[PDB]
Amino acid sequence: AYELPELPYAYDALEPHIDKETMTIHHTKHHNTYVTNLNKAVEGNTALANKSVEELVADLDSVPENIRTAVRNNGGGHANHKLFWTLLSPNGGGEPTGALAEEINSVFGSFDKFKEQFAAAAAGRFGSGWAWLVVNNGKLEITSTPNQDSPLSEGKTPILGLDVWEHAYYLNYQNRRPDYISAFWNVVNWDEVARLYSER
Amino acid sequence: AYELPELPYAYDALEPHIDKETMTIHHTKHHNTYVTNLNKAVTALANKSVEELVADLDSVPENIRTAVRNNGGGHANHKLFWTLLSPNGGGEPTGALAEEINSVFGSFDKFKEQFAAAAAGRFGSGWAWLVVNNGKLEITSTPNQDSPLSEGKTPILGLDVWEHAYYLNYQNRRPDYISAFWNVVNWDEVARLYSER
Ligand SMILES: [Mn+2]
Ligand SMILES: [Mn+2]
């Protein structure tokens, strides 16, 4: 009984970094489709349905082989986008602070180095996928996954993610993925990332 | 070594099925990029056609295999794709090709349903294909720029389902794009490829 979450802001609140039309289609069509298909996949499996989408994707091995693909793709779609909306803000941007900033400077050397490495991962993901900042064994690291696969399935907790499926940027940037990635930094809600960091 | 092929028609020749903006960007940016990157990756491999190159990545240095796989596949796939479209295309298959399709799939309509299902079912980026395997017609789909050629199969018809191929005009509506695709397919070219394979 999963549901499509409402956005924390207006559809045009992230302009011009992300266009109103993309936000509208991305949320009401793409994300919504993952929710619809996810509910159809777990229909009848009270056990799986009672778990949060994150818990569900965290253990795909416990999902029946007959619907494992559907849960992987659609569960991943729902988990990834639900997190993604909460990481954006019309009042975001800037740089991390507190414990998160300290960890970033210690692991990557500096926030600028982190952005360079994160941008490289996002640009290097061939095909559809996501670029991530996760906590693995209590350590921060950058990774990328294909399609709707989530780091949660490998025991890693994402605290920042960038959707690099073409639907996330084609209307305003077309083939210019690097320009989309650069614009991303202007809307990142580092306060939310910091909260997820503490929880991870 | 490798170069970007010219389109057999104008950028707006496939309208309204495929918009001129998409054709222009798809060819001059996406395809051109695959060519540029392929050339960077590639001594002896240079003398091999892109088709033969992708036909056996196993014989390619593991230090550049991924580059050749993605960019070589990109070049080979798009090179073929452009030749399968035409402003005078569409209609329905004929001759021996039509006979084989009706025999294997039951009818052209059934073939279209199966092809569209494969194309709509490809999760993420990829391609839907009609290939000749061991002399038999089969419908398959590959991820990203992977090609049936790498599996010993010969593609005679292919549909690009990467979102860049249809997002400007169809956005999330991939099924409407697949439907419009039938109006521009060059069946004489598919038939020619089938006869040689
Ligand atoms: Mn998305
Ligand atoms: Mn393409």
UniProtKB/Swiss-Prot annotation, chain B:
Q: What is the lineage of its organism?
A: Bacteria, Bacillati, Bacillota, Bacilli, Bacillales
Location in the cell: Cytoplasm; Secreted
Query: Which amino acids does the record list as binding Mn(2+)?
Result: 26, 78, 160, 164
Please report which protein family the annotation says this sequence is part of.
Belongs to the iron/manganese superoxide dismutase family.
Q: Which top EC class is named for this enzyme in its record?
A: oxidoreductase
One GO molecular-function entry: superoxide dismutase activity
SUPFAM superfamilies the UniProt entry points to? Fe,Mn superoxide dismutase (SOD), C-terminal domain, Fe,Mn superoxide dismutase (SOD), N-terminal domain
Cofactor field: Mn(2+)
Keyword entries, A-Z: Cytoplasm, Manganese, Metal-binding, Oxidoreductase, Phosphoprotein, Secreted, Stress response
Q: What is this protein called?
A: Superoxide dismutase [Mn]
Where does this protein chiefly localize? cytoplasm
Report the source organism: Bacillus subtilis (strain 168)
Q: Say yes or no: keyword Phosphoprotein present.
A: yes
User: Phosphothreonine (modified residue): where?
Assistant: 33, 66
Stated role:
Destroys superoxide anion radicals which are normally produced within the cells and which are toxic to biological systems.
